[model samples]
Target: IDVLLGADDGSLAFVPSEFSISPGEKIVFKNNAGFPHNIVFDEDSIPSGVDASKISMSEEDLLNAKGETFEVALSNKGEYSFYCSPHQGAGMVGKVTVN
Candidate 1:
């Protein structure tokens, strides 16, 4: 199914603030704002730092779709931290608790 995420003020803001998912579930990181946004998993999550040759994205499963359509599959159960590639350092970070 679809997991709801948000980006407030066009920064690295995730809507709902928090999210949880199960292993092997699919999560879609949608850009609910007008600006371009992308989610990148922390190095702790994806060490390689490349999803299908795409930079600044999670190697596990990165969605490069533009215009508010990005999807990824959660295979492992653990805590995941992600942020907007452009605004990550600007406190635009979010976490996902997979169980």
Candidate 2:
């Protein structure tokens, strides 16, 4: 699983905004601050030059910090977009490339 870092200033953010991984790999979206955040995948299949608002993820994938880490598996090969549920429109957006 890949490790992700989220910003804590009440603004959606990401570390290493652009990531590439192989199929079957896993991406971990982690929140290192004292706030709540989530990584939601986009609804579209392919994230080809898509807008941040266009991406959507499963609600089940939303992970909360309970003094633990969260993980998301990248089983598919394609470009996917994700965002901070509360900050997507505020520039808290990112992209994941799975090959």
Candidate 3:
């Protein structure tokens, strides 16, 4: 599955902010128009045993990921919350429920 980081209106939010997936499924974050944005997992919001720290793109890596992608695999079961590093204050967030 894919999620857009920004829309044509220049909004700083994640499209389809909430989604569900099976274990091992992948979700890719895409940036078509947004210049600098990154997907960051909220450590306390993820499932136990899941390493949230290892599941995100940093702000410094956003430029290299523009128009490309940042992918994360839903390897554990539960709900996961994340946000765009640069736009979190703007409510640029997303959720993934893995089963």
Candidate 4:
């Protein structure tokens, strides 16, 4: 899955806002028209036993330039909810179901 932190129409959100995949697959979250976007997770929404530090990618990982990306990989079967740390007010959110 290729997720964007922002849209072309000035909307702030994870483009494709929701998506799904199988275990071992990687979700590629990247920057779009909105620069300085970072991927973040909702702690209560993630599956049990996942690493917070890894999933809660740092702001340093933000794409300063267009097309830069970050990837999240899950190996368990469950739902994972996340949002953009920089655009929480914009509801820059999304989820992934790995089944």
Looking at model 1, residue 47 earns an lDDT score of 29
Better of 1 and 3 by lDDT: 3
Choose the strongest candidate by lDDT. 3
Tens-digit lDDT string for candidate 2 (27-86): 666676533667677766454454433333445445566335556566556888776666
lDDT of 4 by residue, 1-99 (tens): 787768978688788988889988988877887778888777778888887677678645566778888887888788988877777887888888888
Across residues 31-83, which tens digit of lDDT does each residue of candidate 3 receive? 85665788888888999788876777655567445677888787889999988
List where candidate 3 sits over 4 angstroms from the true fold. 64-66
Global lDDT of each candidate: 0.58, 0.62, 0.81, 0.80
TM-score of each: 0.65, 0.68, 0.88, 0.88
**C-alpha-based local distance difference test score of model 1:** 0.58
At residue 46, candidate 3 shows an lDDT of: 92
Q: In order, what is each prediction's RMSD in angstroms?
A: 5.0, 5.1, 1.6, 1.5
Candidate 4 has a TM-score of 0.88
Evaluated at residue 74, the lDDT of candidate 2 is 63
Worst 10 residues of 3 by lDDT: 57-66
**Cα displacement (Å) at residue 40, model 1:** 0.4
User: Which runs of model 2 end up more than 4 angstroms from their true locations?
Assistant: 8-11, 45-62
